[PDB]
């Protein structure tokens, strides 16, 4: 006699909770836009860095897990050093050349966290300028930055990794050929551990801040999620050219 709408009861059960946009009007639009744009360009840079690393001689020779590990530990080193290089190559005081269409002036940075990060980057840029680092030295130093951190217990292809890293150190010495220069450039490589540690800290802070809810692209988000614990686990071993 009376047909019940049985499926509507199941349609009710499966209806998901309303999604939140994450929108907070207290955060200025300019702020939200530059952070979001920087994260988006940043994500695209990690992709570029992964395709670059797959093309580095010796790199493909390591175990897939070690390649994975090295990329997860070094993505911020590669990005910060390339940013220092492009800013140095622009020659303008206090300008950070994130991209040819996104040249930030640190003197226009109103957000204090971003202002602090930019000042460290200006030290990287200032150092490449003081030392007049050539493009050839830069390429060698960038490759060494991919091989600067390892896991506490080491890699699966440790012997081969050490052989490959050794090869790139030798490569840097040849490109320069005064030994003094080597000490100074490897000292600049060593100082990048501190720079990156501050950049990762600001990045991790923003990534977890659910009130600001700045957007992050998918791949940057996975790499940050995998790394955060390690940056507290004491699982990262920094490789130093010099003491200490």
């Amino acid at each position: 006699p009376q047909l019940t709408p049985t499926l509507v009861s199941l349609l009710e059960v499966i209806e998901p909770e309303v999604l939140y946009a994450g929108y907070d009007s207290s955060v200025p639009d300019s702020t939200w836009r530059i952070m979001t744009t920087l994260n988006m360009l940043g994500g695209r840079q990690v992709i570029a860095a992964v395709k670059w690393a797959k093309a580095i001689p010796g790199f493909r020779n390591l175990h897939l897990d070690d390649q994975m590990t090295l990329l997860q530990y070094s993505w911020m080193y590669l990005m910060a050093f390339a940013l220092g290089w492009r800013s140095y190559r622009q020659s303008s005081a206090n300008l950070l050349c994130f991209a040819p269409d996104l040249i930030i002036n640190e003197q226009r940075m109103t957000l204090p966290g971003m202002y602090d990060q930019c000042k460290h980057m200006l030290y990287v840029s200032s150092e490449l300028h003081r030392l007049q680092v050539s493009y050839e030295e830069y390429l060698c130093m960038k490759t060494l930055l991919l091989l600067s951190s390892v896991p506490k217990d080491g890699l699966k292809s440790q012997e081969l990794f050490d052989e490959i890293r050794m090869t790139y150190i030798k490569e840097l010495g040849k490109a320069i050929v005064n030994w003094q220069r080597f000490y100074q450039l490897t000292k600049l490589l060593d100082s990048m551990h501190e720079v990156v540690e501050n950049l990762l800290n600001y990045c991790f802070q923003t990534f977890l801040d659910k009130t600001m809810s700045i957007e992050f692209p998918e791949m940057l988000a996975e790499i940050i999620t995998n790394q955060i614990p390690k940056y507290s686990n004491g699982n990262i071993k920094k490789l130093l050219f010099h003491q200490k």
């Binding site: 992709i47 992964v50 797959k54 897939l64 994975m68 996975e222 790499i223 999620t225 995998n226």
Partner: peptide, 10 residues
Amino acid sequence: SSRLWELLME
């Protein structure tokens, strides 16, 4: 991890 892995495996 996963997105990185399939990029590396390509």
